[PDB]
């Protein structure tokens, strides 16, 4: 057994750990008070879902996790909610103002004074940690603490940490839930200083889980609660693995291995089938064909682009539930007949696939309907660099002309690592090209 | 804890400023006496930004009432909530400043700033965690506007690192107490400029035009502009006052309003604006086709002759959200011509549940756009009109001023209006 | 009030929508960087596909497929067909087409020369012509030896295929000629005919003895009245209408042009389209594909109908600009964007 | 369409179908970053003081 630590950073970070932790939570039959019936072992044992909770003696089952923000309203809640009892004190770290979407604020200013109380809460974490895996970091590209605050623990944690993988779930900004302009340049700050630390990110758009709110689940306005509700499903059937037994993705040195052949190139695209309303009178399930077949629409990818215009470099599978190897291969062969799936030559033309007999947790009240069977594909395709494009052209349109430049250099960063983080950007849009386009 | 310090100076400052602390005070559910008679927890969320907490579960206003002659004050003291403001938060001289500018900058009010200091840093001390100040004055007399620029310069200089803003009342010759408005204004403007983070522009013509033509007003007194004043002051600080998805703090606010230091001068809007047909209910797409209307701004500038850089609209009441993001894309997606396209989703709304006292629902307008320079522009065409003729410089040159400090105030603010104007096109 | 914007000034096609979607003073154009648009007139090359179908609330519309360029290029044309089960390699209704890279650079070359050593073997007709997408650059020749010379001297992908020698001449003149059909594909991927369609004639007799000179090999409006001393002498601009040819083809051949020649165009039109809609299909898509096609086939003397290319980016015929434009706006426009017959077009029905 | 190294056990299994073969800075360097961003803004502020000053 070998741990793994979460880190949530700022607000979307922090507000979406909660929401995989009530997940992982009913998942593994752990209530808000810590206790769970079925560990027959009391305060101890090197169980699958030990990878993620340590125990006490007293038979509590504390999340591997550290919630930072540099303000305190948002991490309030989670220790006056109703899992308040899983942590202790030391597990959330929240300062007193926050970095105003100001990324060199988040980095520089406010960053340096409070990193050093991070890494130390981390440590704490990682001394109870026999064989630590590494971390995942959850945080928003348009947040100053989920970007500039981000980019500092990475580079640190590769520093203190240097052979422990680290993966991300990173928030892409969607202007539909923000009010913020300067997240372009936040986004492509925290990209260009984080890139030769993260092994592996797993971006959501915004505005993927706007639209799958609004049209599978018939939310005319979809809250927070409704976007993370949603996005710790995700996140949930990604890291089902490292809590479950099982063989596929069981450390997530794993991860980069089968999704990751270029280092820079480490996006995968997330795409998840089926998203049921619970209101509705009663839903025909889906088969194994179609819930497979709906992972090539777009309209259930956690990013807006169209792989049919990109080349592939790896393909998993993660079905939860009803679902046999048999009934997969039967889909796989249907859909190549019928899709367009071209992967890069230097890479092989198949599909990892990954099967958890226990069907999809739901929330009780939640807005998701109970399935018999959901599947979780994550693609590596060039196509989305879609997003690195648009996100980059909105850059441009603004540095063009200096637009709130003046607010990052007077938080004591060079208006340089503006062009240099830029260039990283091109580099890496010209990296998908050379890769995904003849 | 994120708490805003109340600075309010002058005869305009404290007349405007009592009307903002009375409006509000009745939307927490403060009484007069500070007592809360409220029925909603969401009026006491963020009580503490502009309230202290007293004895007794008192609420005292976290505001400075600054003069440097009495009877002003005295007329608050006992105004309507005149008994709920800090005793020792009255700071005032008897020296008066006869509409001078350099009498409240260098002469009279540098004699009474240190001890306006000494009850700022009490208040501030105070504060968890300080966001910011607000300063309530005109630019046109001499206290609000000569001392008050004098007390921003000094306030900067002991919290260089705290937001500064500022509601300021531009003089207009139409709604004018004395000839030299335009240059106490023009000298005040060149310190807002450097020295604020925001600032909400307010000409007292648009005030009066909005009290006569729209309101029906046949006759507008202080009193009427000042209810306009008192809305849009409770309009621009709901976001602060009340809980929301926002979570915007004045430093996040001026971080996505001002793409430039020195252009930070907003046009504040307020809908709906009816004469006594004044309980018909207010569609969303009429809220929101007012809100925009020109006639329904403060700063007395077509917004059609500009450009803006970003806006911020806030709606209050209960209402469907969906209705209004589709009537705000509908004026964008209609009049995208007069946005700036270099700045990518440049029009930000947010609303809030709470209605303003007496409406339904309502719509407060924050508009950073290139238009304002139209408002520097008369300043500086009355301004040089005297000065070419060094009229009534006696006033000031009598205080110590040189007329040298008058051509650079006339370059100051002819380079902001040049600055306004290069990214226009 | 509906938005638009114009990325591609030299497009004499939306040139005339624009004006049309003007005229009806509810729709607005802006500036070509604008982002808040209903409608893109895209750009020919390197459109931004990515970028559309990202602003709140609006509904984004662009006049050009992502993905039809494997259709409207030489050589990908020739490996889609070949390549394509729906189409097969024995696709009768395309001529014998093989790539070529020049040797400074998968290739056909092998492949070429075994089907023309076969041919000069059997006696049989062993023309072939040379073209390229870079073109204004075209050979045709009987050896293989001048066809790959000619292609090595350049440096970009050609494509040789089977030139029609028994191609259907036009009485008088004794003359070669080409058929034009715009075909407008919908956001729903209807497929539509546009009535009328052009040919595009030599005004030079035909001769199977020379085709050095490539006056009456080559069709193109532009080398006829450039190169061709004939030009505008049997029909105004080297251009019949379908009215004109019909009536020939039934005092000449004693038949009609629906059945002798529309029916296979019609046919040729669906396959190609047919093929490619599961790769270029917008319909779950966060934005709205339409374009207009140009589709060029060749008439032999057998009355069988070939496929010579599709163009993406086509024009009109000067006569036809209002007609065509307008019913743009109609089907492929106002059927997103409604404003506030008898179609001209011919609907080819198919399953999705 | 070849399955291959199939591992099933009491909660699920996994396998590998192939249906084609194929064709930083040190701790000592982000002080100094972090150093420097914080002199130039002292640097900044020192002019403001300055500015006030005169
Ligand atoms: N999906 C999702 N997105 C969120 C959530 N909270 C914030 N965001 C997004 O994150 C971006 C704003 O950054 P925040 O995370 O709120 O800011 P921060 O990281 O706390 O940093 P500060 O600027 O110091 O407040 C916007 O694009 C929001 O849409 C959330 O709970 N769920
Ligand atoms: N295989 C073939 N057999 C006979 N003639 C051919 C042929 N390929 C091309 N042609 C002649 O060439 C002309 C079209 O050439 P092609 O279409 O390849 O060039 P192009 O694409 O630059 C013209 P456009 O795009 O405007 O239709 C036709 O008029 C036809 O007569
Ligand atoms: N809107 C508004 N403007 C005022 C009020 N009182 C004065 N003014 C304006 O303020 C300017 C005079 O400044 P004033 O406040 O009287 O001078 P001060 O007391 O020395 O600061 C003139 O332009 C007046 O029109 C008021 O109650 N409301
Ligand atoms: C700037 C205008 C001004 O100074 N006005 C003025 C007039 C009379 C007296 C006594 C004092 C005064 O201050
Ligand atoms: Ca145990
Ligand atoms: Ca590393
Ligand atoms: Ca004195
Ligand atoms: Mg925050
Ligand atoms: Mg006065
Ligand atoms: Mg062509």
Redesign the pocket.
Same mark, same amino acid.
């Given at each position: 057994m070998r741990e793994c630590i979460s880190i949530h950073v700022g607000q979307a970070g922090v507000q979406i750990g909660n929401a995989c932790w009530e997940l992982y939570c009913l998942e593994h039959g752990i209530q808000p008070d810590g206790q769970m019936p079925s560990d027959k072992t009391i305060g101890g044992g090197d169980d699958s879902f030990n990878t993620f909770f340590s125990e006490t003696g007293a038979g509590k089952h504390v999340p591997r996790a550290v919630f930072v923000d540099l303000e305190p309203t948002v991490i309030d809640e989670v220790r006056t909610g109703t899992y308040r009892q899983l942590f202790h004190p030391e597990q959330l770290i929240t300062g007193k103002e926050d970095a105003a979407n100001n990324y060199a604020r988040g980095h520089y200013t406010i960053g340096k004074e409070i990193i050093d109380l991070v890494l130390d809460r981390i440590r704490k974490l990682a001394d109870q940690c026999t064989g630590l895996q590494g971390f995942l970091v959850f945080h928003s590209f348009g947040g100053g603490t989920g970007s500039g605050f981000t980019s500092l623990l990475m580079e640190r944690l590769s520093v203190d940490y240097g052979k422990k993988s680290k993966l991300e779930f990173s928030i892409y900004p969607a202007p539909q839930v923000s009010t913020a302009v300067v997240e372009p340049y936040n986004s492509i700050l925290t990209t260009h200083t984080t890139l030769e630390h993260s092994d592996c990110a797993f971006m959501v758009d915004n505005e993927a889980i706007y639209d799958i709110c609004r049209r599978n689940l018939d939310i005319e306005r979809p809250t927070y609660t409704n976007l993370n509700r949603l996005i710790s499903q995700i996140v949930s059937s990604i890291t089902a693995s490292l809590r479950f037994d099982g063989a596929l993705n069981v450390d997530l040195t794993e991860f980069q291995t089968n999704l990751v052949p270029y280092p820079r190139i480490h996006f995968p695209l997330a795409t998840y089938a089926p998203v049921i309303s619970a209101e509705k009178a009663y839903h025909e399930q889906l088969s194994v064909a179609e819930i497979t077949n709906a992972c090539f629409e777009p309209a259930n990818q956690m990013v807006k682009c169209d792989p049919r215009h990109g080349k592939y470099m790896a393909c998993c599978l993660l079905y939860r539930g009803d679902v046999v190897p048999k009934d997969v291969n039967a889909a796989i062969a249907t859909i190549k007949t019928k899709r367009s799936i071209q992967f890069v030559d230097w890479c092989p033309t198949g599909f990892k696939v990954g099967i958890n007999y226990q069907p999809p947790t739901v929330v009780p009240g939640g807005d998701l309907a109970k399935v018999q069977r959901a599947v979780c594909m994550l693609s590596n395709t060039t196509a989305i660099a879609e997003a690195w494009a648009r996100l980059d052209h909105k850059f441009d349109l603004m540095y063009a002309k200096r637009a709130f430049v003046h607010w990052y250099v007077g938080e004591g960063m060079e208006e340089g690592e503006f062009s240099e983080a830029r260039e990283d950007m091109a580099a890496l849009e010209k990296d998908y090209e050379e890769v995904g386009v003849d | 804890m994120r708490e805003i310090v109340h600075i309010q100076a002058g005869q305009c400052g404290n007349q405007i400023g009592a009307k903002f602390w009375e409006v509000i005070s009745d939307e927490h559910g403060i009484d007069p006496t500070g007592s809360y008679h409220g029925d909603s927890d969401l009026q006491l969320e963020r009580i503490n930004v502009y309230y202290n907490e007293a004895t007794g579960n008192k609420y005292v206003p976290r505001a400075i009432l600054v003069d440097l002659e009495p009877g002003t004050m005295d007329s608050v003291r006992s105004g309507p909530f005149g008994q709920i403001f800090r005793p020792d938060n009255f700071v005032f001289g008897q020296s008066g400043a006869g509409n001078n500018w350099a009498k409240g900058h260098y002469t009279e009010g540098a004699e009474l700033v240190d001890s306006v200091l000494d009850v700022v840093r009490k208040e501030s001390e105070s504060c968890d965690c300080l966001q910011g100040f607000q300063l309530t004055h005109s630019l046109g007399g001499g206290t609000g506007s000569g001392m008050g620029t004098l007390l921003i310069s000094k306030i900067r200089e002991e919290y260089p690192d705290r937001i500064m803003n500022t509601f300021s009342v531009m003089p207009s010759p139409k709604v004018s107490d004395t000839v030299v408005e335009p240059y106490n204004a023009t000298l005040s403007v060149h310190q807002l400029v450097e020295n604020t983070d925001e600032t909400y522009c307010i000409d007292n013509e648009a005030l009066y035009d909005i009290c006569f033509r729209t309101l029906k007003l046949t006759t507008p007194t202080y009193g009427d502009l000042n209810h306009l004043v008192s809305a849009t002051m409770s309009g621009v600080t709901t976001c602060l006052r009340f809980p929301g998805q926002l979570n915007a703090d004045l430093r996040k606010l001026a971080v996505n309003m001002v793409p430039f230091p020195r252009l930070h001068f907003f046009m504040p809007g307020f809908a709906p604006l009816t004469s006594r047909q004044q309980y018909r209910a207010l569609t969303v797409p009429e809220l929101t086709q007012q809100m925009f209307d020109s006639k329904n701004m403060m700063a007395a500038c077509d917004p059609r002759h500009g450009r803006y850089l970003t806006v911020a609209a806030i709606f209050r009441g209960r209402m469907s959200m969906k209705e209004v993001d589709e009537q705000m894309l509908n004026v964008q997606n209609k009049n995208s011509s007069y946005f700036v396209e270099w700045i990518p989703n440049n029009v930000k709304t947010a609303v809030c549940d709470i209605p303003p006292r007496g409406l339904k629902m309502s719509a407060t307008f924050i508009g950073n756009s290139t238009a304002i320079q139209e408002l520097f522009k008369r300043i500086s065409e009355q301004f040089t009109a005297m000065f070419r003729r060094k009229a009534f410089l006696h006033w000031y040159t009598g205080e110590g001023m040189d007329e040298m400090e008058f051509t650079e105030a006339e370059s100051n603010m002819n380079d902001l209006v040049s600055e306004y104007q290069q990214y226009q096109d | 009030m509906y938005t638009f914007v114009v990325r591609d000034e030299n497009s004499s096609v939306y040139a005339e929508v624009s004006r049309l979607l003007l005229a009806t003073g509810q729709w607005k154009r802006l500036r070509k960087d604008n982002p808040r648009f209903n409608l893109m007139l895209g750009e020919r090359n390197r459109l931004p596909f990515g970028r559309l179908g990202h602003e709140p609330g609006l509904v984004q519309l662009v006049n050009y497929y992502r993905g039809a360029d494997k259709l409207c290029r030489k050589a990908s044309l020739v490996k889609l067909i070949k390549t394509s089960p729906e189409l097969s390699e024995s696709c009768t209704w395309f /001529?014998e087409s093989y790539v070529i890279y020049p040797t400074n650079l998968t290739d056909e070359r092998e492949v070429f020369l075994a089907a023309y050593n076969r041919r000069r073997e059997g006696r049989e007709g062993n023309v072939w !012509?040379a =073209?390229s997408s870079a073109?204004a650059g075209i050979l045709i020749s009987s050896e293989a030896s001048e066809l790959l010379d000619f292609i090595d001297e350049q440096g970009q992908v050609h494509v040789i295929? =089977?030139?029609?020698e028994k /191609?259907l001449l036009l009485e008088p003149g004794h003359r =070669?000629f *080409?058929i034009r059909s715009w075909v407008l594909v919908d956001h729903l991927y209807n497929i539509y005919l546009y009535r009328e369609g052009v040919l595009?004639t030599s005004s030079e007799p035909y001769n199977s003895a020379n085709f050095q000179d490539k006056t009456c090999?080559?069709? @193109?409006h532009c080398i006829q009245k450039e190169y061709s001393k004939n030009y505008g002498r049997y029909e105004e601009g080297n251009e019949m209408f379908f009215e004109e040819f019909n009536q020939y083809l039934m005092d000449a051949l004693n038949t009609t042009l629906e059945n002798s020649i529309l029916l296979q165009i019609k046919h040729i039109i669906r396959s190609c389209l047919m093929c490619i809609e599961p790769a270029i299909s917008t319909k779950h898509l966060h934005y709205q594909s339409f374009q207009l096609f140009g589709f *060029?086939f060749?008439v032999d003397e057998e009355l069988k109908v070939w496929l !010579?290319?599709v @163009?993406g980016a086509p024009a009109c015929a000067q006569k036809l600009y209002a007609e065509l434009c307008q019913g743009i706006v109609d089907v492929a426009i106002s059927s997103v964007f409604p404003l506030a017959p008898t179609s001209i077009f011919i609907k080819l029905h198919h399953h999705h | 369409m070849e399955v291959i190294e199939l591992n099933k056990c009491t909660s699920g299994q996994s396998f590998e179908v192939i249906l084609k073969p194929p064709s930083d800075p040190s701790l000592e360097e982000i002080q100094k970053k972090l150093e420097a961003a914080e002199e130039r803004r002292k640097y900044q502020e020192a002019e403001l003081l300055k500015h006030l000053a005169e």
């Open positions: - | - | /001529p !012509i =073209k073109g295929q =089977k030139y029609l /191609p =070669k *080409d595009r090999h080559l069709t @193109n *060029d060749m !010579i290319e @163009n | -």
